[PDB]
Design an enzyme around this catalytic site. Structure first.
Site, short mmCIF file in Angstrom:
data_model
loop_
_atom_site.label_atom_id
_atom_site.label_comp_id
_atom_site.label_asym_id
_atom_site.label_seq_id
_atom_site.Cartn_x
_atom_site.Cartn_y
_atom_site.Cartn_z
CG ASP A 191 5.67 -30.92 -25.35
OD1 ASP A 191 6.55 -30.82 -26.23
OD2 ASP A 191 4.94 -31.92 -25.23
CG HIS B 62 10.67 -28.53 -25.96
ND1 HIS B 62 9.69 -27.76 -26.54
CD2 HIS B 62 10.04 -29.61 -25.43
CE1 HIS B 62 8.52 -28.34 -26.37
NE2 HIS B 62 8.70 -29.46 -25.71
#
Lengths: 298, 298
Positions: free
Chosen positions: B108, B278
């Site tokens: 991320d 994610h």
């Protein structure tokens, strides 16, 4: 507490199958429906409605679910807050007054109701004015980095409940004031009558009112877009004479040149920029009123 | 109160000219820097870092401004939270440990630091792994309606202060949990160790930390994009061998085929999807750890 900003206007509760529409009604002559947008109520017209009331019966309505209009129960597809459903409900509200053919000016969300109304039921409209919008399809089609940042609230408020509802509740007063301020030319609230701001603030203070606004933006991201897409693909143009007004530093001119865009959507469209941010009728009431009276008189 | 999720790891406060980097340090062998992203802290690696510590000197760092790292005061350009500045700060931090050449894996935001580091200072990196990202430029370039809805937070958190901060402050717990849950494959919090969630929640409970996160996203909308744009338009590719890992249900795969994209940015890139949302190192720790071990060992 809340000020009356429409002296000489009556207040009407128009019943419809989906709930009551609240409206201030003044003037006489041909019927002219005025539709506010987000995050406002009908009182955003308070500076231009008196000038319009000199020549028209001015109906200044809270959109379904906004202000003092009833909040129809939403569903999985945000159906009552789709511009198509809102348009049908306002058509029904106008029929309660005996107005089946009327002029229509909308700003922001109300302008989306307005052009969808013009696309769905053009026979209802003598003339149409939209203030500082492009069609919903065009906003999404032009979605890029710059636009995503500028109209971030189109994707933020369209997030599944209760995400935007919860965050808006974190500081609703700040949010509505921030939205009002950030879209004016000045960048503060000096363009607004403070009594008007109080109306917007009180409306926004209601969690159910905020949920409706999110439902409106959810419809804006989904059904409203698909309805627009059908018309784009079918080549359906608005056949009503229409006026597109936009602020020189409004939201509509951030995406494209508004008249060029509207010509792809309407066969008879005039347009003019107003020296103003997004809130044309409050930031530039005289220029907005004059452009409207001239157009609606022809 | 907060659990130690890295039994046997040292704790280090690395001083840099931009503030202290906090890091857990374990293992032995070649140096491997692990960078978390949003809205997490270094503890997101707690399931994979022990496996990596069997073969590498694992440095599990809080990003500048995140977790327990110091928060450099931002400026009008969000400079300290640009990935370029963060990369420079982390290079400084690694140099304090004697690591001038190291392997790097980021997830991320930390993956954005990582590839920016690899572009600015490729000689610092033996190998680079990026987890569930595309370059910041590619997210913005692919910003259409569908993607603007999926990663609305890219534009929402980039809104000028104090708008996101004021909304996040009403109920910070809700937002961090909403974001954690919404990007997992399961759509809830079951993938996370609750002790890890507590770390994330406590970090997010601090308004200064939330401000930093917004600054990070503001950098992500502006200077980070500009820096990426320069590189992609100049054809500057990452020359460091790199691994792109993404979740099959993650963010990167949403608007592009990740390996095709990374092949445009990196001359020596291999990729693998992992069945995960994610949060690869927490949703799929074994698979993630194996991919990283295999890659950094080759």
């Amino acid at each position: 507490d809340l000020a009356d900003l429409f002296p000489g206007f009556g207040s009407e509760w128009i019943n419809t199958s989906s709930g009551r529409i609240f409206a201030r009604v003044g003037g006489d002559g041909p019927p002219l429906l005025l539709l506010h947008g987000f995050p406002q109520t009908h009182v955003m017209w308070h500076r231009v409605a008196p000038k319009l009331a000199e020549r028209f019966k001015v109906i200044v309505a809270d959109l379904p679910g906004y202000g003092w209009s009833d909040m129809p129960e939403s569903d999985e597809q945000h159906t009552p807050y789709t511009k198509r459903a809102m348009a049908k409900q306002l058509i029904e509200a106008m029929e309660q007054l005996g107005h089946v053919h009327f002029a229509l000016a909308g700003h922001d969300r109300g302008a989306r109701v307005s052009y969808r109304l013009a696309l769905d039921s053009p026979g209802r409209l003598s003339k149409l004015a939209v203030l500082d919008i492009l069609p919903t399809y065009e906003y999404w089609q032009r979605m890029n980095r710059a636009y995503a940042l500028k109209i971030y609230h189109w994707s933020f408020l369209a997030q599944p409940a209760p995400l935007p509802e919860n965050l808006l509740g974190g500081d609703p007063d700040f949010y509505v004031k921030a939205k009002l301020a950030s879209w004016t030319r000045a960048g503060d609230l000096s363009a607004f009558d403070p009594r008007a701001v109080e109306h917007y603030r009180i409306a926004f203070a209601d969690p159910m009112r905020r949920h409706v606004m999110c439902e409106d933006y959810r419809a804006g991201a989904y059904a409203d877009f698909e309805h627009d897409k059908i018309d784009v693909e079918a080549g359906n143009k608005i056949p009503v004479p229409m006026l597109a007004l936009w602020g020189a530093s409004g939201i509509a001119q951030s995406a494209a040149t508004p008249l060029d865009v509207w010509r792809k959507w309407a066969s008879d469209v005039q347009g003019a920029p107003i020296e103003s941010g997004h809130f044309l009728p409050e930031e530039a009431p005289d220029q907005t009123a004059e452009a409207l009276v001239r157009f609606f008189s022809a």
